[PDB]
Design a protein around this ligand. Structure first.
Ligand code: Y6Y
Ligand code: Y6Y
Ligand code: ADP
Ligand code: ADP
Lengths: 575, 96, 576
């Protein structure tokens, strides 16, 4: 049957559910001699196709509890006045086979009322379901798990104490989980040796477990269409050996990925960033300060408690393409905490639409995925949108920033969410953002140094084949004030020049065989196998400094606008 | 340049993958009115034999005046369905 | 059974309910010979999981009244046309066992109609329930108590005279009540000696009684997972001695608190502030004036009545940021032992941006219910700053939120208990109507802390942290010529951060030594930095900064002398 092996994604909420349900189910007799209330209901919510029903079935099988599935529309499709009988009989049957697990798939259909509550019979169904759910006499060990797309879609009374008192957001699987899902979905098709499922997994961003299964099936169907159809040898049952002779090639998977259309790309991603400190070449003072502020409270919470100091839970990066987003990702990676990034377009959308309640939802999501690093990238976007030199007649306060401040003030309770803010215009940022209890720790990210520039060039060119002849230290030193974005542009232009030269050359060489068919075929391989000095020289010919020295001067002004006075530098105690 | 940016990633995707370079998926034509930017976009779409979707300025102005920007989501979804496609935003400066 | 001991939180509304219900129930025969109308219905409302049903059951048990529970959805889940029979039979059965208490849990389901009143059968249920509730012939002593999340959620006709004429807001338990709830929920698990339930209670802000029970259960489950599972010795019934051998450690409670997710952190807090005058080192003139304005009318109401003077019920604190206005308001509330409600600027800005000023009415009603209370409007000038301040909008200083606040204040004073305190760092831009008589007229200026005040602020900030006696605090306070309270707090926090970093780095290196060069005899020398030293404070003060410039202090001095008591009456003498 289905078990933990079938449950893919390694998303680490299956472990939480296990810790939740073993003792109530794995050790049911224990609770008989101990006075404790187990989890009467667990609400699994997330994007559709994430395997919530699969997870519930696997838990039921691995714990031995009698699994009962109450399909939402199955009862809803039944005639009014007798569907209530179906729900009551389902609970009674689950009660009989104690311990039992009752799974309500698509719970947002039985009790969708969000206090709007249209209709008459559906109100009866929701109220009776409430009576049954609250009617659990704590006898036996029936655990009611329900599936829902979002927590707010179901009736709020279902979310109350004793009905569904604890919720788990399965969420979209990540690259590691996408790879494991691909492995589980590719185990009987005799996958080819060339295909590794790693490149596909990385390119598979935005898919869900159902999406991964559909992509694998589409690749298999492409393989079946490409071969074994030309022969057209078919019978009632295709020969096992004949079908096994085919191997799903990388090309088939690539085409399937091109024909994927993932079912929820837009959904926000809660993922541990893969970026590491290696990608950033320097910022040692900044790196150490970030390590302090974030890592120290958790690695050594006892020492923070000993001195009675509460660590700051907000940091605001200010600077000119210098790597603030990358720095935030790296700091999140070092602590192995989930990273949530709120770019400027999202804030601008909330501001234009006059919908700031999304800030509440974003903060709740960050709270659920703890430990997390809630990063508000380019937080000054709203101020720029309203102006910056003259702007609106009013002050710096705006709806979105006010909601963010309210959530931060109401935050800190969680002890895990850490707010990081990045802004290229510190002058226009609202001052309230920098007050204590908010993003008070201001960190300045300067233009990368020569060593930092070398590291940035190496990180950008790690994947590309770069000839050892081209000296990278010389190029980094040559770039007196290039930003990280400028270095990335130079590397991309060099790669583009190399690609164009290689394409043009092999194209001509192919004319050369077509025009003059050679008697003996002897390919000399690639005329340009790796990026050379001339490519980099031509690319650097177009190198440009995006960041002018005047805006760096303004940042230096603000930095010295956070000046530690000029009279205490020699402070000595009287002794 | 247009041939490079659009056609090269598809005609020779393998060589783009070899150097680990992701081709740019956006190009902004700037110039005086009546010089053939719309025609150039149509020609580049024709060379690649990819579907062409044109969003003229009146449509953007209608979305802006009506405060209905969800149409952008619908337009992008339609462009995604009709792949390969060249989503052209003609006279994008109309709102400004 | 369940009684007052089970009812935790010590939130002091259980006492009010007791005073409400003893004589009607504890002395039912008394009302037979005396002509008086007892409380026919009591509406208990508050956040879910606060124990309203538990409180009702405890009252019923401790008074001997026959408790009847009418679950909201229990009747609502029944078939239409026969649920009305269930409600009528419930009232008749409660009538038979006089005296009896009828508890309607989740009343917002039987009669949710807020004049929207969707559907047909639910209108019948609400009207029939109204007929029954108003149909109490004052015979027997059935008391109908109902539970609801908010007063406005239920049908207004239920709120009318004779149906539910008196309401009690149980509200979220406080630190003292959170601690007592933890004690009641931790009494049979054999809590460990290291765990005290005091630190957990302080860190437990935002939880409700149900949340506290869930946290305790989660800690117990963590303890059960950490131990007794490794051995894996299990049978049909776990041995009592084996299970008793385990003790819930502080670490388990800490993890559970990390995994709490309290079910209503956002809900407004009505709590007696723990801040005391000790935290503020000075402001003796301000302290005495605040004591007068707030404490004197209540401590000696008779003397206020004798002279026919109505004490001012509004005070507006003005001064530079970080000087302790919020702390002063908390201290004054603590001295009078009155509930404190704080409305920070973000809330006002949210009401202004959302064009929802009816929240001011709700806030004032909540303050009225929790009397005696000190309704503090922190940073009241936020809306004026948002609209400008130098040029601003084309219109005047009037805005929607301030206008609603003025309307509520004008309609206030009836309660005789709510006291409005306003704090503003920009007195120039504050609306003048706020300062008119009957409003926050008593303007109090909070100046930058003095040397003695600075010493007190440093001591308060460093009370928890281990500070070596070598570091002289008076010298540091005197050295800081014009540091604000916030600046002193920043200096102390930076010193603590430096000490923490040094201690972490040092013990980390010392651990490498042990690992690099395994010593033959283990002899830990304890902590290399056990308390904050002079060098830490010197390095921290190296980064000390004056947040408040002298020009803004000059503007505050201008406004202060802009409330100048004339210049010709100083020598006023009566003719004699
Ligand atoms: C001991 C303590 C821990 C804490 O939390 C620690 C923590 N855990 N996970 C996280 S989050 C995750 C980590 C990486 C990404 C984010 N954190 C955390 C906390 C603050 C800043 N960054 C992380 C808070 C406050 C305290 C205390 C300090 C003084 C006193 S007294 C009365 O003066 O003696 C009482 C209590
Ligand atoms: C006697 C009186 C008491 C009063 O109320 C007293 C009071 N009790 N709780 C509170 S509130 C709580 C206390 C700490 C936090 C808040 N207060 C109160 C009142 C005013 C200001 N602060 C507190 C009002 C007005 C009067 C009177 C004065 C003159 C006359 S005559 C016709 O000229 O002879 C008639 C009536
Ligand atoms: N991590 C996974 N491992 C194996 N199958 C998965 C996984 N995630 C999703 N699936 C696929 O998703 C299909 C249906 O999705 P389902 O489990 O019902 O979730 P939901 O009810 O939210 O749509 C299943 O048949 C299963 O094959
Ligand atoms: N102060 C308290 N003392 C003991 N238990 C409490 C307390 N507060 C809440 N609870 C717990 O809350 C649980 C259910 O909450 P309940 O009393 O029904 O309030 P509500 O109906 O508003 O949700 C109870 O089983 C009880 O254990």
């Amino acid at each position: 049957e289905v078990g933990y092996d079938d449950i893919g994604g390694c998303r680490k909420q299956l472990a939480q559910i296990k810790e939740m349900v073993e003792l109530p189910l794995r050790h049911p007799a224990l609770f008989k001699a101990i006075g404790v209330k187990p989890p009467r209901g667990i609400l699994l919510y997330g994007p559709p196709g994430t395997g919530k029903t699969l997870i519930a079935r696997a838990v039921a099988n691995e714990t031995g509890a009698f699994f009962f599935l109450i399909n939402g529309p199955e009862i809803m499709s039944k005639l009014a006045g007798e569907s209530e009988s179906n729900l009551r009989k389902a609970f009674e049957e689950a009660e009989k086979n104690a311990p039992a697990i009752i799974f309500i798939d698509e719970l947002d259909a039985i009790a969708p009322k969000r206090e709007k509550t249209h209709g008459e019979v559906e109100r009866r169904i929701v109220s009776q379901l409430l009576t049954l759910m609250d009617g659990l006499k704590q006898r036996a060990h029936v655990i009611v798990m329900a599936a829902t797309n979002r927590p707010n879609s179901i009736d709020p009374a279902l979310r109350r104490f004793g009905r569904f008192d604890r919720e788990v957001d399965i969420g979209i699987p990540d690259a590691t989980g996408r790879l494991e899902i691909l492995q589980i979905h590719t185990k009987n098709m005799k996958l080819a040796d060339d295909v590794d499922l790693e490149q596909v997994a990385n390119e598979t961003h935005g898919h869900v477990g159902a999406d991964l299964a559909a992509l694998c099936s589409e690749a298999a169907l492409q393989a079946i269409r490409k071969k074994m159809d030309l022969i057209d040898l078919e019978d009632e049952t295709i020969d096992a050996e004949v079908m096994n002779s085919l191997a799903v090639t990388m090309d088939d998977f690539r085409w399937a990925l091109s024909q994927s259309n993932p079912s929820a790309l837009r959904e926000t991603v809660v993922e541990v960033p893969q970026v590491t400190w290696e990608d950033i070449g320097g910022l040692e003072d900044v790196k150490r300060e970030l390590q302090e502020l974030v890592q120290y409270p958790v690695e050594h919470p006892d020492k923070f408690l000993k001195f009675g100091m509460t660590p700051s839970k907000g940091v605001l990066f200010y600077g000119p393409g210098c790597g603030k987003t990358l720095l935030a990702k790296a700091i999140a990676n070092e602590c192995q905490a989930n990273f949530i990034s709120i770019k400027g377009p999202e804030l601008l959308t909330m501001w234009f639409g006059e919908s700031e309640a999304n800030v509440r939802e974003i903060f709740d999501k960050a709270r659920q995925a703890a430990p997390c690093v809630l990063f508000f990238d380019e937080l000054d976007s709203i101020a720029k949108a309203r102006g910056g030199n003259i702007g609106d007649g009013g002050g710096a306060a705006d709806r979105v920033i006010n909601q963010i401040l309210t959530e931060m003030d109401g935050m800190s309770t969680k002890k895990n969410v850490f707010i990081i803010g990045a802004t290229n215009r510190p002058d226009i940022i609202d001052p309230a953002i920098l007050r204590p209890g908010r993003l008070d720790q201001l960190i300045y990210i300067p233009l990368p140094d020569e060593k930092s520039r070398v590291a940035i060039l190496k990180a950008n060119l790690r994947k590309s084949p770069v000839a050892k002849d081209v000296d990278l230290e010389f190029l980094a030193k040559m770039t007196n004030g290039f930003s990280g974005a400028d270095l990335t542009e130079i590397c991309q232009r060099a790669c583009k020049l190399a690609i164009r030269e290689s394409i043009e050359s092999e194209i001509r060489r192919e004319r050369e065989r077509q025009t003059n068919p050679s008697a003996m075929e002897v390919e000399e391989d690639d005329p340009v196998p790796e990026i050379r000095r001339d490519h980099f020289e031509e690319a650097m010919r177009f190198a440009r400094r995006s960041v002018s020295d005047n805006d760096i001067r303004k940042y230096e002004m603000f930095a010295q606008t956070l000046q530690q006075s000029r009279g205490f530098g020699s402070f000595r105690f009287p002794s | 340049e247009l041939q490079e940016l659009v056609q090269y990633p598809v005609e020779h995707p393998d060589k783009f993958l070899k150097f680990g370079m992701t081709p740019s998926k956006g190009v902004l034509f700037y110039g005086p009115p009546g010089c053939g930017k719309t025609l150039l976009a149509k020609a580049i779409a024709n060379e690649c034999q990819a579907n062409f979707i044109s969003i003229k300025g009146p449509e953007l102005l209608t979305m802006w005046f009506g405060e209905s920007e969800a149409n952008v989501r619908e337009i992008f979804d339609k462009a995604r369905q009709a792949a390969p496609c060249v989503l052209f935003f003609d006279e994008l400066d109309s709102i400004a």
